[PDB]
PDB file of C-alpha atoms in Angstrom:
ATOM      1  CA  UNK G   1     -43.923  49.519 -10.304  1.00 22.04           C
ATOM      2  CA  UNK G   2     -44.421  52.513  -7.658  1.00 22.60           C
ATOM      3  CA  UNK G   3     -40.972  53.271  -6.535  1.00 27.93           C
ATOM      4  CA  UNK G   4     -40.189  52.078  -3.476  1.00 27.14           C
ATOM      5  CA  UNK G   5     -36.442  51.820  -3.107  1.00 21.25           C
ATOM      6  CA  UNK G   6     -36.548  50.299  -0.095  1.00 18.66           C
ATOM      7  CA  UNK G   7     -37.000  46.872   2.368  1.00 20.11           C
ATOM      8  CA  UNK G   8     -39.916  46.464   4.504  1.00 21.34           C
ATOM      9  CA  UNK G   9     -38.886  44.277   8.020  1.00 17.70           C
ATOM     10  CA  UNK G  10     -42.104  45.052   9.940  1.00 16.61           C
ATOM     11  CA  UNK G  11     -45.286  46.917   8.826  1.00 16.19           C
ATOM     12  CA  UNK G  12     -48.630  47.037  10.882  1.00 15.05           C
ATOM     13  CA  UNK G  13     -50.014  49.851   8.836  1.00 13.99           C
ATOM     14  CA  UNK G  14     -51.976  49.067   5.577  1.00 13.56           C
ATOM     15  CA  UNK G  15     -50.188  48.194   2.435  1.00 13.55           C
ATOM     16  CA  UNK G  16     -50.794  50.828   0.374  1.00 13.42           C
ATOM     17  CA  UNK G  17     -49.916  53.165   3.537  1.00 18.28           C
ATOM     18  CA  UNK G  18     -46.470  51.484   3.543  1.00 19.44           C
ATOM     19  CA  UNK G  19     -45.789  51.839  -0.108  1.00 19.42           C
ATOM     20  CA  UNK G  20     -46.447  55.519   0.572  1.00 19.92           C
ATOM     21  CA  UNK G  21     -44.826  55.612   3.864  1.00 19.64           C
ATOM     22  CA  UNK G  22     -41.124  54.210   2.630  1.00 20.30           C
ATOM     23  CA  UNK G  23     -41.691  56.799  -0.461  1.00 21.41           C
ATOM     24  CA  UNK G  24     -41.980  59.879   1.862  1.00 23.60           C
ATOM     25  CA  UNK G  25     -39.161  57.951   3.684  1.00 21.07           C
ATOM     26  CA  UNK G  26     -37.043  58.605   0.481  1.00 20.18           C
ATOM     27  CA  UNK G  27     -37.853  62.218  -0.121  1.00 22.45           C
ATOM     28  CA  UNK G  28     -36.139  62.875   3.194  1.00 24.50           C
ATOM     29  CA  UNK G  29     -33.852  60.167   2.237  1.00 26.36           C
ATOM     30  CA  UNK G  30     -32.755  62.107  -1.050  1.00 25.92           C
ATOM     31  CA  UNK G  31     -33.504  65.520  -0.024  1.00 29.39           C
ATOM     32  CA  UNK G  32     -31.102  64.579   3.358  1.00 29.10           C
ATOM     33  CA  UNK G  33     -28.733  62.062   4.393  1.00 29.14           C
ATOM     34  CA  UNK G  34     -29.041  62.847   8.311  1.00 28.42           C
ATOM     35  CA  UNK G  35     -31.078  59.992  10.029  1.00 29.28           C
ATOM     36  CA  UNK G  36     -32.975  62.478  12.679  1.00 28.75           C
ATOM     37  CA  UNK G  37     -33.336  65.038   9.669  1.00 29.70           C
ATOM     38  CA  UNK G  38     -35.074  62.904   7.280  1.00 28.66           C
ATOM     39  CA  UNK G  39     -37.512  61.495  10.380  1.00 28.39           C
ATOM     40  CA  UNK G  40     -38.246  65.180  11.100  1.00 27.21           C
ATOM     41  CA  UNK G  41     -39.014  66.127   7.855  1.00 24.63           C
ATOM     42  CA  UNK G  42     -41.057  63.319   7.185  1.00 24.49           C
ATOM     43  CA  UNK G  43     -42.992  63.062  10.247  1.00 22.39           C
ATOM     44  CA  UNK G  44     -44.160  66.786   9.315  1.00 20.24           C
ATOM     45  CA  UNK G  45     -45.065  65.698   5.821  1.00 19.37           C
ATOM     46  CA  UNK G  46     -47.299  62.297   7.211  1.00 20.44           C
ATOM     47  CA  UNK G  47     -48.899  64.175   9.744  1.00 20.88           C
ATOM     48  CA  UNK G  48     -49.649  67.530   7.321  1.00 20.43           C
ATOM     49  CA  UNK G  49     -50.472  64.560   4.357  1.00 19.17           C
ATOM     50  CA  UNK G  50     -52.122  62.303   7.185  1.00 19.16           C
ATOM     51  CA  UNK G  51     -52.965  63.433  10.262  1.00 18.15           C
ATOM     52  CA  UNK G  52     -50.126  64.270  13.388  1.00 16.47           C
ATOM     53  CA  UNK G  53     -47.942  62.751  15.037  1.00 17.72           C
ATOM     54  CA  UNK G  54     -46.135  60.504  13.327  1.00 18.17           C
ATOM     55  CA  UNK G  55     -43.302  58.692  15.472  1.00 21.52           C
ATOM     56  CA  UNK G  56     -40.798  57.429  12.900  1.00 21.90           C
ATOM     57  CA  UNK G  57     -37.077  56.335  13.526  1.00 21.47           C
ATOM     58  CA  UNK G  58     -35.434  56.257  10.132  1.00 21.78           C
ATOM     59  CA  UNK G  59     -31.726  55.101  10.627  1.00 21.30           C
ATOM     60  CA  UNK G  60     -29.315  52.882   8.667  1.00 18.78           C
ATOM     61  CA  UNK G  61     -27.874  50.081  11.504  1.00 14.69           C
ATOM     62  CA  UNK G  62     -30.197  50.431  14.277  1.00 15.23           C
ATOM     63  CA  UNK G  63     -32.808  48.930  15.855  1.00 13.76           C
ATOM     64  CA  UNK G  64     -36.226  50.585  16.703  1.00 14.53           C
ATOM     65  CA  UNK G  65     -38.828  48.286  19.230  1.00 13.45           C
ATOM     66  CA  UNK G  66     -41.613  50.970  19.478  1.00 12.15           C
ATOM     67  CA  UNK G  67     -45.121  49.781  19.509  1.00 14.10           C
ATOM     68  CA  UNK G  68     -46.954  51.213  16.720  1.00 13.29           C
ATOM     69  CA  UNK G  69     -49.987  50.955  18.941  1.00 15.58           C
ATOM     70  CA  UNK G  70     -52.077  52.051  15.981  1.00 17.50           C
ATOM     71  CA  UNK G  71     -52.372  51.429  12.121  1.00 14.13           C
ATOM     72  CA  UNK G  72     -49.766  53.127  10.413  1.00 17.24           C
ATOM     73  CA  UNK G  73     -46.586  51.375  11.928  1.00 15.75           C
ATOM     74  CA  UNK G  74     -44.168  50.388   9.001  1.00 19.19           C
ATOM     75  CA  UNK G  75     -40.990  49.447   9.386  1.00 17.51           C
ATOM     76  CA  UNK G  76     -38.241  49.213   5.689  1.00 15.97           C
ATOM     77  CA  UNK G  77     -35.194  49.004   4.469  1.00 17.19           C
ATOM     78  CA  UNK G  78     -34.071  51.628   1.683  1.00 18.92           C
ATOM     79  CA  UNK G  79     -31.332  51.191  -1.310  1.00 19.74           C
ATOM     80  CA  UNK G  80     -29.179  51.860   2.299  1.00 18.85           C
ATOM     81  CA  UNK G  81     -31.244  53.215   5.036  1.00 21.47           C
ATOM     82  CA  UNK G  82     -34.090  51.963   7.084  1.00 18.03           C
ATOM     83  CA  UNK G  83     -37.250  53.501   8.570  1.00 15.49           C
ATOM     84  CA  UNK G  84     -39.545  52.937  11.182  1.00 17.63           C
ATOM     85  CA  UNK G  85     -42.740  54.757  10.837  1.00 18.46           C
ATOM     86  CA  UNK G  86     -45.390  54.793  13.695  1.00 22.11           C
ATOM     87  CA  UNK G  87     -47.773  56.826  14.761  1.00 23.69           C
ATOM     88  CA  UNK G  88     -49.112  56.731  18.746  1.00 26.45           C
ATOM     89  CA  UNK G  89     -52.781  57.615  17.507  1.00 24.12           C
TER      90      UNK G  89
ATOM     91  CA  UNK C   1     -19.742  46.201  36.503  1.00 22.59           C
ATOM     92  CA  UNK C   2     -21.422  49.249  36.299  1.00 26.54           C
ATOM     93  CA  UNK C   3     -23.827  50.532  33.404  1.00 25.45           C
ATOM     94  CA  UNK C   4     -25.187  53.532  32.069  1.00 24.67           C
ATOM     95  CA  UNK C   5     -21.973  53.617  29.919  1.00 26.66           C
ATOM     96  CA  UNK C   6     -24.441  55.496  27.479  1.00 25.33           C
ATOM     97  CA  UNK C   7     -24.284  59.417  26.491  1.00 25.57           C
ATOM     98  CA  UNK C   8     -27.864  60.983  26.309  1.00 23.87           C
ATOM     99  CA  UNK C   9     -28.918  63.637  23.831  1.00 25.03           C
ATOM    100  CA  UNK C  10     -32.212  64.188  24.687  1.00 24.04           C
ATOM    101  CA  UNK C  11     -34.627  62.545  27.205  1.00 24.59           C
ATOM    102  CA  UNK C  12     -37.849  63.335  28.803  1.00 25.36           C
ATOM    103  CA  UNK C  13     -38.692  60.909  31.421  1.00 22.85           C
ATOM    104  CA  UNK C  14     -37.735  60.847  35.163  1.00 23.54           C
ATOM    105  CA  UNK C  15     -34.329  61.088  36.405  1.00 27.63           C
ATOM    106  CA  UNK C  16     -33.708  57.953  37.604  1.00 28.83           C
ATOM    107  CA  UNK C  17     -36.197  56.755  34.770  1.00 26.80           C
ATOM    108  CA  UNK C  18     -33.338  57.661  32.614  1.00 26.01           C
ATOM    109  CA  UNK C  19     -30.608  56.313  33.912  1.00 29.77           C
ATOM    110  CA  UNK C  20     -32.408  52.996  34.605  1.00 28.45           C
ATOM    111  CA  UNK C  21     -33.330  53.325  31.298  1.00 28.31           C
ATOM    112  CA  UNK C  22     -29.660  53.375  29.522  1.00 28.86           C
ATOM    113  CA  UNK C  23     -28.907  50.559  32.220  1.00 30.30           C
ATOM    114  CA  UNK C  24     -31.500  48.298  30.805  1.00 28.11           C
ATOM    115  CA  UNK C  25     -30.425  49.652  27.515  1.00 32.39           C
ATOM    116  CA  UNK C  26     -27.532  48.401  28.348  1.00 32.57           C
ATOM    117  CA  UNK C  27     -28.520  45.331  29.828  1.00 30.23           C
ATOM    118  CA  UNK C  28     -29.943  44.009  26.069  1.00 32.20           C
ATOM    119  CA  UNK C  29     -26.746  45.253  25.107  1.00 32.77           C
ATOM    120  CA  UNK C  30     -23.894  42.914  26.837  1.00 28.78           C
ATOM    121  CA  UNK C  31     -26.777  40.000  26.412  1.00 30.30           C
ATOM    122  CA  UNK C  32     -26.856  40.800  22.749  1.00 29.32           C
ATOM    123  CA  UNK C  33     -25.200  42.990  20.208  1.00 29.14           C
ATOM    124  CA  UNK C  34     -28.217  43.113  17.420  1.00 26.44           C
ATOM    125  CA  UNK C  35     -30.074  46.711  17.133  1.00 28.05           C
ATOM    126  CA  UNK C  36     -33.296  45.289  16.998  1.00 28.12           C
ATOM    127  CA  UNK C  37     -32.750  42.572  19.665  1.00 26.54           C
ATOM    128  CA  UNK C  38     -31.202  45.161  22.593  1.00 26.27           C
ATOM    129  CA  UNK C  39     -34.516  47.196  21.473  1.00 30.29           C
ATOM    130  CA  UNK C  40     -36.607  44.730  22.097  1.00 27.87           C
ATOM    131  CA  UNK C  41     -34.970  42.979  25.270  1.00 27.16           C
ATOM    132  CA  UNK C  42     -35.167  46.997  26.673  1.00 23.08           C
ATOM    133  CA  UNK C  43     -38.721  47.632  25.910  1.00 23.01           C
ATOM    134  CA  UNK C  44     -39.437  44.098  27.106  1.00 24.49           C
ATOM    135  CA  UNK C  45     -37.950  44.867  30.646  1.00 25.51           C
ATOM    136  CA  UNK C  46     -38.882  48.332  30.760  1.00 23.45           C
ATOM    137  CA  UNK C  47     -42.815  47.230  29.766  1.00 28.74           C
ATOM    138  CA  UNK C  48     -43.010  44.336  32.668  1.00 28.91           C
ATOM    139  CA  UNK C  49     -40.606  46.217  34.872  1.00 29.51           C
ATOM    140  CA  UNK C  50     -42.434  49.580  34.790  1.00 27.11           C
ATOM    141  CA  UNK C  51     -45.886  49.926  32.966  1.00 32.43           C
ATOM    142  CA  UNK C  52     -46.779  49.270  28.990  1.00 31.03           C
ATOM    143  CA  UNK C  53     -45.852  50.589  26.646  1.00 30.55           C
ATOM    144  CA  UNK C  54     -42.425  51.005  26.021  1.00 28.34           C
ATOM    145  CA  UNK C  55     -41.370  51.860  22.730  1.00 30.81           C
ATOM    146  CA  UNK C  56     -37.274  52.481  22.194  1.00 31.78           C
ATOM    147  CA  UNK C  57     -34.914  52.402  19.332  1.00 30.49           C
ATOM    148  CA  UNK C  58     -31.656  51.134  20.034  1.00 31.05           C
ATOM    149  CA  UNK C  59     -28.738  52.138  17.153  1.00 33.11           C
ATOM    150  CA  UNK C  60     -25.854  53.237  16.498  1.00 32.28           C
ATOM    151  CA  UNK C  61     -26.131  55.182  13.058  1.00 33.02           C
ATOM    152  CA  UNK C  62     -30.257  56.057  12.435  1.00 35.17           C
ATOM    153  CA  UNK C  63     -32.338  58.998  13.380  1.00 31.69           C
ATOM    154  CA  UNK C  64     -35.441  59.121  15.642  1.00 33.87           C
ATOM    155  CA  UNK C  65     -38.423  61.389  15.458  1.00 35.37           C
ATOM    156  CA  UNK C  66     -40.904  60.547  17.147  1.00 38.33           C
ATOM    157  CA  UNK C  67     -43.477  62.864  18.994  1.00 36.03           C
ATOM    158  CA  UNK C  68     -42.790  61.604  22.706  1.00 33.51           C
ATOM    159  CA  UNK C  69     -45.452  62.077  26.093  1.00 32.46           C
ATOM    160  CA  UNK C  70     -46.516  61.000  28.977  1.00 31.59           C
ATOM    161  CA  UNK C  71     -42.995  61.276  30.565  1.00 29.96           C
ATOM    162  CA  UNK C  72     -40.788  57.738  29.851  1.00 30.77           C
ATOM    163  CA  UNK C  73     -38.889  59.069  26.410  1.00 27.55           C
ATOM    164  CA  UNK C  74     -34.963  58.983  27.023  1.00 23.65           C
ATOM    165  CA  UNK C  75     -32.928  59.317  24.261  1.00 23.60           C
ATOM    166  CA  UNK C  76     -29.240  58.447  24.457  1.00 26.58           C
ATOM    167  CA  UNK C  77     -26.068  56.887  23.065  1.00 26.07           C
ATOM    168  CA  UNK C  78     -23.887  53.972  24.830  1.00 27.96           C
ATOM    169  CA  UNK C  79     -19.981  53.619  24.480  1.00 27.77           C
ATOM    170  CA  UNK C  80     -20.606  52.442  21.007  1.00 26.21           C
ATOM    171  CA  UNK C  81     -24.751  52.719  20.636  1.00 26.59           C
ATOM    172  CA  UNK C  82     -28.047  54.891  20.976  1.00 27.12           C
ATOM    173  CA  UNK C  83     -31.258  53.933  22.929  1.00 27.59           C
ATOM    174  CA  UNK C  84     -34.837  55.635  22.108  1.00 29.79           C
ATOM    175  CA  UNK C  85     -37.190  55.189  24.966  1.00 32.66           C
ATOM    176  CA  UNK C  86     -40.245  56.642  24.684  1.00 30.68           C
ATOM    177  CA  UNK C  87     -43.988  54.942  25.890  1.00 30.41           C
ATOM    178  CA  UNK C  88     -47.480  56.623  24.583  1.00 32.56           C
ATOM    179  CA  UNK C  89     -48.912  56.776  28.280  1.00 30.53           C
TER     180      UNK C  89
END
């Protein structure tokens, strides 16, 4: 339907914010294979795209426990890589 | 018995704050072995054990980026793991 390649586990941020938030996920996620890379790159793009800071933990076999204390807190699984978006706003 | 069998790579909280932190990192470690669940056991301690709110990523293959504060955001990697503490204070 609208991409998304990946698998939501925990997303406190509005729908259509998360179908956009895993997507940006993915640019970093096919533009770079380096877990802190594609969270920096992102981060820059959702904060430039949305508004700063945007605290997101995009890994592959860890486990983030931040509290998105906010709105746009969304947590997936990609094709084989998760991430865990959250902004302290 | 002894923890803080983690190896830091970038924190920004208080001394001591960090090495407690990678203890208690720890701690949710030897009582469980699941990314999320060490996360969560951390921030749990960390949140009634210091002042709210703790957000950390525990892992052992992602990537954090996150834009840290106040002064409670250790960052570091156990025998086999990682730990991202960082609050919003």
């Amino acid at each position: 339907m609208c991409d998304r390649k990946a698998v939501i586990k925990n997303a406190d941020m509005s729908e259509e914010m998360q179908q956009d938030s895993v997507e940006c996920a993915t640019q970093a996620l096919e533009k770079y294979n380096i877990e802190k890379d594609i969270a920096a790159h992102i981060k820059k793009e959702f904060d430039k795209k949305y508004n700063p800071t945007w605290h997101c933990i995009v890994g592959r076999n860890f486990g983030s426990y931040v509290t998105h204390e906010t709105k746009h807190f969304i947590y997936f699984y990609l094709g084989q890589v998760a991430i865990l978006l959250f902004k302290s706003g």
